[PDB]
Amino acid sequence: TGYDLSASTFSPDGRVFQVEYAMKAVENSSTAIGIRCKDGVVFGVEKLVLSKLYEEGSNKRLFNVDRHVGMAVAGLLADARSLADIAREEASNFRSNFGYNIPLKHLADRVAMYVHAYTLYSAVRPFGCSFMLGSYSVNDGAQLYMIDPSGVSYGYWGCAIGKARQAAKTEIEKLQMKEMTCRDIVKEVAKIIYIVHDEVKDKAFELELSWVGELTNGRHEIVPKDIREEAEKYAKESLK
Amino acid sequence: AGFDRHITIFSPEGRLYQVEYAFKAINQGGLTSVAVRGKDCAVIVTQKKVPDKLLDSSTVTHLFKITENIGCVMTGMTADSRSQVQRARYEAANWKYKYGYEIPVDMLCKRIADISQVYTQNAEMRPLGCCMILIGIDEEQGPQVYKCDPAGYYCGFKATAAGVKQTESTSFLEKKVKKKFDWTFEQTVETAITCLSTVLSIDFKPSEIEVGVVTVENPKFRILTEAEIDAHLVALAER
Amino acid sequence: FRNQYDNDVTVWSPQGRIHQIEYAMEAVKQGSATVGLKSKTHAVLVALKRAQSELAAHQKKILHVDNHIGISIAGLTADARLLCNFMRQECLDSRFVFDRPLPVSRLVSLIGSKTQIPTQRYGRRPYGVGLLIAGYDDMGPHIFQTCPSANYFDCRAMSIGARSQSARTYLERHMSEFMECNLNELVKHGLRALRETLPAEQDLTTKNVSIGIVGKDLEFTIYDDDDVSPFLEGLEERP
Amino acid sequence: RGYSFSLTTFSPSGKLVQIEYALAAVAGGAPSVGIKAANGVVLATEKKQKSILYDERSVHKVEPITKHIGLVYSGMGPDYRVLVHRARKLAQQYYLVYQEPIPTAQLVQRVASVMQEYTQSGGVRPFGVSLLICGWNEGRPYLFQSDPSGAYFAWKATAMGKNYVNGKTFLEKRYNEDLELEDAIHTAILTLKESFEGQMTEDNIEVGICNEAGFRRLTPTEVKDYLAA
Amino acid sequence: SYDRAITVFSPDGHLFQVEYAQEAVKKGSTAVGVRGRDIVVLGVEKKSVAKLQDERTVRKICALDDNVCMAFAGLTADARIVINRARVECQSHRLTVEDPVTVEYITRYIASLKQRYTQSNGRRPFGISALIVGFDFDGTPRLYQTDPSGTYHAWKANAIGRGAKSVREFLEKNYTDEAIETDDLTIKLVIKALLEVVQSGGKNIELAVMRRDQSLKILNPEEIEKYVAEIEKEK
Amino acid sequence: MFLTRSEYDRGVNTFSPEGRLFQVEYAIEAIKLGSTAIGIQTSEGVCLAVEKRITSPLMEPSSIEKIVEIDAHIGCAMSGLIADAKTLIDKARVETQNHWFTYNETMTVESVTQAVSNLALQFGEEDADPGAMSRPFGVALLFGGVDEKGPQLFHMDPSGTFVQCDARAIGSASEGAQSSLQEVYHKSMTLKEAIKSSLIILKQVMEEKLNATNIELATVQPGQNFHMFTKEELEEVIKDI
Amino acid sequence: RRYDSRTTIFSPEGRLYQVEYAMEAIGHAGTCLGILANDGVLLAAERRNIHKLLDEVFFSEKIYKLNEDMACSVAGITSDANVLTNELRLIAQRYLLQYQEPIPCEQLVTALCDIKQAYTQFGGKRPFGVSLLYIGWDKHYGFQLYQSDPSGNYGGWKATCIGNNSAAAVSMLKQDYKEGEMTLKSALALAIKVLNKTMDVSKLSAEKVEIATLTRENGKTVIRVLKQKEVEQLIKKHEEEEAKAEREK
Amino acid sequence: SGEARKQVEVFRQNLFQEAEEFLYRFLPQKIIYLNQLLQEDSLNVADLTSLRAPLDIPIPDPPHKCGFLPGNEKVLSLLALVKPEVWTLKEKCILVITWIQHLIPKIEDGNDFGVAIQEKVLERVNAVKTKVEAFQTTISKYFSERGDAVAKASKETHVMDYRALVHERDEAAYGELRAMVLDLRAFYAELYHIISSNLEKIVNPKGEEKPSMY
């Protein structure tokens, strides 16, 4: 069947398989979770340590796309770094022309349209990265948006991407995140990240946590190591 | 075979199979959209299904505003749908800039549809798999409903449907137009909801349906609030 | 069969893997091994060069991008020469524009972006050179490896090339000692780690080992055939 | 075999198959009939619609390129609009350069040249619509057909679309060169009647007439009168 | 497998499409060149009159410029393009360096054009091999040959085209300093050689001579008749 | 048990399972189709020798040009497709000249090889320029010259890799000639010994008996510029064999 | 296997099949015949189109006047022909603008043939599938007839026929044409005789043939398409002449 | 030669009329007739034991050629009903196969879609032919097998498996006759369905002459 070879092609039943195949790529990558609470958005990534040789605090999967917005990526990392660059360029342009920090909903849309373009043409493959963007602005509020390789963009109160997406969603679902405050959520994100990690299949993980909110004064920033350490302890204790 | 697999190649019987395959994609979404034109109002209703509780309900919509007075419901692949909406919004503004008056709905469908033919004739791109239904009020011709399909066909209809149950939906609507009674705003909305509900057998609650209306009295496209949708839904059940 | 899905970088496999990129990654294994390690004050690259014939000279495995940055190539030499030129020009550009040595990390990001474009677009093959980049910048000594896949990693130490697992193994066991090591000790540790990659009959010689050292006070220098003699003499005998 | 897929490949036997396949698309198209009377040319086509829901006023199969030239099509509908727009544009370019309405023969040569261009490149697909172009220039009626191949022929009368072969035979039997348009429009409705496969109604058929006055589409009421015969 | 694209190289490093274009030259009409001490003679076989066909239009031997003449074997149309392009260059060199083109410069230019066509897919190699005869400023006679590949070599005498193998063998045995001693003898050698491969007699050979400063002269059919007669009589 | 499927060989820009980029490898095989060329670098100078492979007596021997002068200091012996060599010899000639214009100095043999190599590397569709051959070049060049570092011989291959070689043979009999070269080469040999040794190796590899016409020999001793032995000089050396 | 696609691949045996395939197409086309006579040159073509409901609005379906001094007839894909005829008319007008003299006949043919060769050499375009006969008077070589092929190879022929049953026509012409003795009147007769044999229809309709003659009168070339009455007379004269030979037999 | 074409065209015109007639009348009528047989009680016997036919071979015991052993009458009467039916289907299929083969068009490079519709149908008709031909063979084998088994039983009166085989062979034939009528009914139906749905291409594969591009 030659229907799946290209994204230009459409299968007789109407499905563009190459895009679906690209979505399977994200499942290969490790889980990453983002939860939006009233104060702001907290993102967490379980970063597998493949080798002791690799430096800690490197191979980051959480990128700052602009002062007010942060991106967590899952999927082929190379594409993600490139998508992050597209996002940063778009953010700069919105500031340069419209003169203010990009509204996140718009940013998601512009990046999504770029991602969708790859879906239509046959020369370029669909991007293999699924990413989440989050920002807190006093006027806009706290916003978490996730973009699939298809280019579908939607706003999620809580969201997960990666190998354990289904399992994580069940845990995230029992959180009542809207009421919860940002500091409490960081502990909760860690608990979920620890629960989903499979020790047998994956030897070890370093939790990378980032947050944007009133506490960060609307700047996406890596969680201070004191806060991260406290959370990692809370998580191991909860794992029992 | 091999007659399918490229939009450009024509089948030995001249059927351009890839374009037909795209129309199948609209159905793969699993959602249906119904539009009915009243004497003074045009309404578009679509099924809103939220897959996960986590997703914010506000973000998920198939109803978009091309311009202040034109509204569209796009059924098909979600990503392709957003792409067409942007082109429509760009085209709508470009008309105001160049010609100085708001684009007539028919001309927006014509431009959007013509763009689709280019995709159908050029080899590299794939026909976008989405169908857009536009509702607007033209002062000269009153309310207007137009649908553009992935082929580039742009017919305007008194009432139409797109999606999994389109054929069934069309039959229900056809019976209602044949017994013409004209439609007041309430009836136009009621007919739309009854049609979507009957074909899907859903017995809808306010959350599952998104309804958008354009009226001669208030020409601007408005997406009705859940309460407004509930009021019409309650009336349908009461009578 | 699955012969399909492997022809081009633009085709995603049914299970989410782009095979050509993986095939490109295999190219680094074909090349001779190179080991890079770092100490708080210095970064060292050591390489095992190979020769076509006794009469022929050993190939260059370590190349100088700039005073603060140097690279060791494992894989197709051609891709390396091309990437090195891009890197050299990017560094020269920073000095002309900002009069600052380019942060080593920033250069690796640029090499990644250039490297990724071949992966997503039909046309150029993915670069099949694996590069170890070493430099001292204000942040400190840095050792980074770049895969034929554009992904790049920051490493305390790394060996890329044929039989490089053996070197990675030695490096992991003796890794803690490296941070406080003196330059002679650090190059010595590295020469031993690459020795593991060598076949048992073969031995490190002045001819096949190239050492490149960059540090706060040392501009990247590639000690070559007769200048590796000081570092090699102190080494012991095969375990 | 291999010859069938490419458009730039002549088959052994020197046939460009994709063009032949393209003509097949026109054959599947709704019946269209054109008769050139002495006083005028009548273009008529079936506009059968799947449902009462469709609003007929919205789209017209018979369209006016210029005041005196009008065309009807059989084939892929999206394609007709592209050609019509290019045609309307090509005519306006003639007016600007020569400040005279374009002779019909000239437009058909120009529209056909556009069609041939689409045929040459591999990337594009041949247009799948054939156009019947009718015009009154220099006090003389003219009818022309342009096929997807890029070839224009001049027909006193012809039918394109489903049952074209049978339609042409009926027309050859019923065609008189001295026919006046009022009689001719009747002949055309009869030709379409042969293959309608449904009760013809004013809405089901669209008809257009070209004369000294220029191309006009008979409105539904006028056709109802002609159908009453 | 490895014969469908010019760019692809076969396992064994043979570029097949270029070799196949050389086969095309073999199907073409024979041509022979002999570098005499003071005259260069280029002779080509004529396939047939066809009776109702004017012969002026069909000319294998052409003058690239005053001092350079070319004969071709291979697809006829391609030759007309190469000949024309060479003529533009001859005149362009005269514009750029004010000096008449040397025979080799024209050979190198013609060769580069052909190589350019072989180098990229999307263009087909010109299926022509040519014999370029010319006299240089020193006045040494020069004969060069070119092939669809783009290799140019200088030959004291050579034959391209159908039957080239047979004539070249005849030339190898027949060619000697003694044969080139007389300008008539040189014309006779080419005629004798073409006779070996031409099915008919003198009626089917078109021959031309370029002298030290004289322009190319296509010998009149009668002059050819005289030469064939002298050769036949001597036989 | 034969698995001969291949299917990744055709088309450059395709990496085989095992990452081998076979089209380039096949190009390296092409140089084997070419006539053998042997270069020996000695302190006295670098000597280059090639087998003409003359098909017919009528072809003029001078025209076959497998040894050419890039500049007085550097010369090249090429084996492989003659045509692609002509382009590579030309890039080299222009680059040596461009260096004189820009820097008023003579390019070292290594830089000139790097320069031609850069052109060879472009076959990968590395650049967007239309005028770049898609196929890897099918020629291998041995570049020998006297520079600041003294006599040097660099060998370049269709891949574009270049390396200094004390002695190398490129061509049909390169395997075997190289083996013999390994045994004969000693760093101390004078050019006179090398010329004799190289011609002895060529006589063994060449099918035809060695004659002045069938071989081309050149030397670039430090004082002298590239010199091509004339038939008379060649006759004297061949007689010594 | 298949060395016959893409027009740029020489087959083992060096044959460009796509051009050969194109030449096959001309064979299906309606026969066109040109005869060169001392007084004038004539082009006669068989209008294959015979559908009753077709109109003769144009000056000719298959004879086109490229320039004041030359004309052409086309056999092959009609659409391709329209492109070439437009080009020929432009090429000629360009020569007149530049040199202010009429284009020599061979040159117009050589230039179109060059466009035709290019389409064969470059990869994307199909070789043009038309073969056309050009008739013209040039000061240099007087009256000339040239035939072109999809290959881009052109030739000068005293008489030739392109299209269906071309071979039969050439054979008839080979015996019948008298070199140096032809006059337009005799040639028009030769044309009717050859056309009658080649065409399947027993009687030339006189609406199934188009005959156009180029003659220089008063120092200006005149290309005239013979009107139907003139052709009908020619057919009658031939019918009678052949019948008289049969009556003698 | 024209005369030759005329006679063959007559054969074709006869084949076309007969084939059309067969599709329009014989095939539908036969589907009803064969279904009637399946419904008939004789082919729907509830207890196969009733079908058992007596084998009067002396059973051996510790202290002549067997009396004539007749074939199961029930099976023979059924076979007599089935054997004519099998033959008509084979003949009617052969008429259809010839008609399609006659209609196959002059081999040409393009427009081979119609040729394919015919070729696909020919595959079904070929498959049906092999299945039906096999049915004719089974009828012959049953008589020979029952006979050989009966002979073996008489020669070796002691072995009782030989006796069981004869009874078993008969029961098997009964099961197979029911299946064969069911298959013939289905085969008549399938040919009507494929030919009816694909008739336009099968009768006119190339289609009507296209507009001239020359």
In this structure, what is the dihedral angle of CA atoms G102, G105, G107, G112, given to the nearest 10 degrees?
110
Tell me the structure's resolution in angstroms, rounded to a single decimal: 2.9
Q: In this structure, is residue E9 part of a structural domain?
A: no
Q: How many residues does chain E have?
A: 235
Write down the domain spans for chain F: 22-240
Please give the biggest Cα pair distance in chain E. 55
Number of domains forming the structure of chain E: 1
**Residue B98 burial (CB < 10 Å; 0-12/13-18/19+)?**
exposed
CATH architecture of F22-240: 4-Layer Sandwich (3.60)
- Is residue C190 within 8 A of residue C37, CB to CB? The reply is yes
Q: Tell if the CB–CB gap between F57 and E168 is shorter than 8 Å.
A: no
The C-alpha torsion from A186 through A188 and A189 to A193, rounded to 10°, is: 140
Q: Angle CA(E150)–CA(E155)–CA(E160) in degrees, nearest 5?
A: 65
The residue in chain H having the minimum alpha-carbon distance to the alpha carbon of residue B3 is H113
| Alpha carbons C4 and C11: distance in angstroms, whole number | 9
The chain D residues in contact with chain H (CB within 8 A) are 1, 3-4, 11-13, 15-17, 19-20, 23-24, 147, 149, 151, 165
Residue with tokens 């978490």: A144
Q: How far apart are CA A221 and CA A211, in angstroms?
A: 6
Give the number of other Cβ atoms within 10 Å of residue F196's Cβ.
18
d(CA B150, CA B20): 8
For testing the chain F interface, which of C11, C88, C125, C149 should be mutated: the one with the most F CBs within 10 Å? C125
| Residue type at H142 in one-letter notation | Y
d(CA G23, CA G18): 9
Q: Which of C107, C67, C104, C72 is nearest to C86 (CA)?
A: C107
The residue of chain G nearest to residue D172, with distances taken between CA atoms, is: G53
| Residue D54 near chain B (CB below 8 Å) | yes
**Exposed/middle/buried for residue F29 (C-beta within 10 Å: 0-12, 13-18, 19+):** middle
Which of D11, D24, D151 lies nearest to residue H213, judging by beta carbons? D151
Q: Which residues pair with B210 in a beta bridge?
A: B46
Q: Which of C12, C113, C149 sits opposite A22 (nearest CB)?
A: C12
F1 token code pair: 């048990």
What SS3 class is residue F210? coil
Residue C34: strand pairing partners: C47, C160
Please indicate whether, in this complex, the C-beta atoms of E52 and G173 are within 8 angstroms of each other: yes
Straight-line distance from the first to the last Cα atom of chain G, in angstroms, rounded to the nearest whole number: 57
Are the C-beta atoms of H191 and H22 separated by less than 8 Å? no
- Distance separating alpha carbons of residues G76 and G62, to the nearest angstrom: 10
The whole-angstrom separation of Cα G83 and Cα A234 is 80
- The one-character DSSP state at H23 is I
C-alpha span between F91 and G156 (Å, rounded) = 46
3-class secondary structure, D169: helix
CB atoms within 10 A of CB F230: 10
Contact at CB, D124 and B124, closer than 8 angstroms: no
Question: Does residue H106 sit at the D interface (CB-CB below 8 Å)?
Answer: no
- Rounded distance, CA F89 to CA F108, Å? 16
CB contact under 8 A, A10 and B54: no
Residue D119: list chain G partners with CB under 8 A: 79
Cβ(C144)–Cβ(C153) below 8 Å: yes
Contact H105/H115 with Cβ under 8 angstroms? yes
Ordered DSSP codes for A64-83: E-SSSEEEEEEE-HHHHHHH
Question: Domain span at residue A40?
Answer: 1-240
Say how far apart CA G224 and CA G228 lie, in whole Å.
Answer: 12
Q: For the stretch A29-67, what's the b/e string if a residue is b when 16 or more beta carbons lie within 10 angstroms of its beta carbon?
A: bbbbbbbbbebbbbbbbbbeeeeebbeeeebbbbbbbbe
Search chain C and give the residue with CA nearest A83. Answer: C113
For residue D165, the cross-strand partners are none
Spatial strand order in the sheet of A158-161: A158-161, A32-36, A40-48, A205-213, A221-222
User: What are phi and psi for residue A208, nearest 5 degrees?
Assistant: -110, 125
- Strand order in G154-157's β-sheet? E53-54, G154-157, G142-148, G130-138, G70-76, G63-67
Select from B26, H158, E76 the least CA-distant residue to A13: B26
Chain centroid to Cα G126, Å, comes to: 22
Rounded Cα distance, D130 and D145, in Å: 7
| Position B202, amino acid | I
Return all residues near A33 (Cβ < 8 A) that are at least 6 apart. A43, A44, A45, A158, A159, A160, A161, A168, A172, A189, A192, A193
DSSP three-state, residue G182:
coil
Of D15, D122, D155, the CB nearest to G53: D155
Q: Which residues 68-127 of B are in CB contact (within 8 Å) with A?
A: 77-80, 82-83, 86, 124-127
The residue type found at F73 is H
E177 and F CB contact within 8 Å: no
**Which helix (H) or strand (E) segment is D94 a member of?**
helix D77-98
Which residues does chain G have within 8 Å of residue E3's beta carbon, measured at their own beta carbons? 3, 12
Q: Is B59 part of the contact surface with chain A (CB cutoff 8 Å)? A: yes
Angle subtended by helix axes C183-197 and C164-173, to nearest 10? 140
Interchain proximity G159–E52, CB inside 8 Å: yes
Q: Where are the alpha helices (DSSP H) in chain H?
A: 2-21, 27-39, 48-51, 73-103, 113-155, 161-197, 199-203
Number of Cβ within a 10 Å radius of residue A158: 27
The correct answer on CATH 3.60.20.10 for the domain covering G17-248 is yes
Cβ under 8 Å to A: B residues 25-54: 25-28, 52-54
Determine, for residues D128 and B160 on separate chains, whether the beta-carbon distance falls below 8 Å. no
Number of domains in chain A: 1
For residue A111, how many other CB atoms are within 10 A of its CB?
A: 25
Structure tokens that stand for E16 in this block:
């097949």
Distance between CA atoms of residues B131 and E23, nearest Å: 57
Separation of alpha carbons D5 and C210, rounded Å: 57
Record: contact A58-C154, CB cut-off 8 A: yes
| DSSP strand pairing (D205-210 vs D41-46) | antiparallel
A58, A18, A45, A11: which is closest to A164 by C-alpha? Answer: A45
- Residue E119: which of F6, F60, F133 has the nearest Cβ? F133
d(CA A41, CA A136): 7
d(CA E224, CA B72) in angstroms, rounded, equals 87
**E141: three-class secondary structure by DSSP:** strand
Residue D204: closest CA among D29, D43, D51? D51
Do D37 and D180 contact (CB within 8 A), yes or no?
yes
User: What's the CA gap between B118 and D79, in Å, rounded?
Assistant: 9
Cα–Cα distances in angstroms (integers) from residue E206 to residues E159, E199, E221, F205, G154, in the given order: 14, 14, 8, 45, 19
Q: Rounded to a whole number, what is the distance in Å from the CA of G24 to chain D's nearest CA?
A: 5
Q: Does B32 touch chain D (CB under 8 A)?
A: no
Buried residues in H49-59 as b, exposed as e (16+ CB within 10 A): eebebebebee
Residues 6+ apart with CB under 8 A from F2: none
Output phi, psi for F107, to 5 deg. Answer: -65, 145
Sheet holding F227-228, edge to edge: F167-170, F37-41, F46-51, F215-220, F227-228
**Which residues of chain B have a CB within 8 Å of the CB of D82?**
114, 117, 121
CATH number at residue D29: 3.60.20.10
Helices (H), chain G: 17-28, 78-99, 105-121, 166-176, 184-198, 228-248
Element of type H or E holding G212: strand G209-217
Cα separation, B159 vs B170, whole angstroms: 8
DSSP state of C161: S
Closest to G171 measured CA to CA, from E57, E52, E46: E52
* Cβ-based contacts of G78 with chain D (< 8 Å): 149-151
Query: Does F61 reach chain E within 8 Å, measured CB to CB?
Result: no
Q: Does B183 touch chain D (CB under 8 A)?
A: no
Name the E strands within A17-140.
Answer: 32-36, 40-48, 62-64, 69-75, 129-137
Q: DSSP character for H108? A: -
Q: What 8-state DSSP symbol labels residue F61?
A: G
CA dihedral E153, E155, E159, E164 (to 10 degrees): -70
- Rounded Cα gap, residues A64 and A153, in angstroms: 19
Q: What is the CATH number of the domain that holds E172?
A: 3.60.20.10
Residues, chain H? 214
Closest alpha carbon to D30 in D50, D15, D45: D45
Q: What span, in angstroms and rounded, lies between the C-alpha atoms of G179 and A90? A: 80
Interface partners of chain F (CB pairs < 8 Å, 3 or more) are C, E
What is the H or E stretch that residue F237 is in?
A: helix F231-240
Element (H, E) at A160: strand A158-161
Q: Cβ contacts (< 8 Å) between B12 and chain H: which residues?
A: 111-113
Residue of chain A nearest C37, judged by CA positions: A53
Closest listed residue to residue F187, CA positions, set F78, F89, F25, F40? F40
Q: How many residues does chain G have?
A: 249
DSSP H helices, C121-155, are none
C-alpha to C-alpha distance for B27 and B111, rounded to whole angstroms: 24
**Is residue D109 classed as helix, strand or coil in its secondary structure?**
helix
Amino acid (1-letter code) at residue B87: R
Nearest to F69 by CA among F52, F90, F83: F90
Is the distance from CB of D19 to CB of D126 less than 8 angstroms?
A: yes
Report CB contact under 8 Å: C29, F118: no
Task: Write out the DSSP string of D180-201.
Answer: -HHHHHHHHHHHHHHH--S---
Contact present, G and C (at least 3 Cβ pairs less than 8 Å): no
Query: Which residue in the set C7, C19, C54 is minimally distant from F182, CB to CB?
Result: C54
Residue E49: Cβ within 10 Å count: 12
Domain map (residue ranges) of chain C:
1-239
Beta-carbon separation of G30 and H214 below 8 A: yes
Find the angle CA(C116)-CA(C122)-CA(C123) to the nearest 5 degrees.
90
Q: How many residues does chain C have?
A: 239
CA dist G13 and E20 (Å) reads 7
The whole-angstrom separation of Cα G66 and Cα G68 is 7
For residue E23, which residues of chain G lie inside 8 Å, CB to CB? 10, 12-14
Across the interface, do A12 and B82 touch by the CB < 8 Å criterion? Answer: no
Count of other CB atoms within 10 angstroms of residue H3: 6
The number of angstroms, rounded, from the C-alpha of E161 to the middle of its chain's C-alpha atoms is 9
Of G218, G219, G234, nearest in space to G184 by CA: G234
Give the integer Cα–Cα distance in Å for F122 and F138: 13
CA distances in angstroms from G112 to B35, D118, G6, G66, listed in the order given = 58, 22, 22, 12
Nearest to H109 among D12, D147, D165 (CB): D12
Q: Residue E5 in contact with residue G3, Cβ under 8 Å? A: no
Tokens coding C95: 């000095």
User: What range does the domain containing E88 cover?
Assistant: 16-234
What gap in Å lies between CA A227 and CA B2, rounded to an integer? 60
**Spatial contact of E38 and G136, defined as CB atoms under 8 Å apart:** no
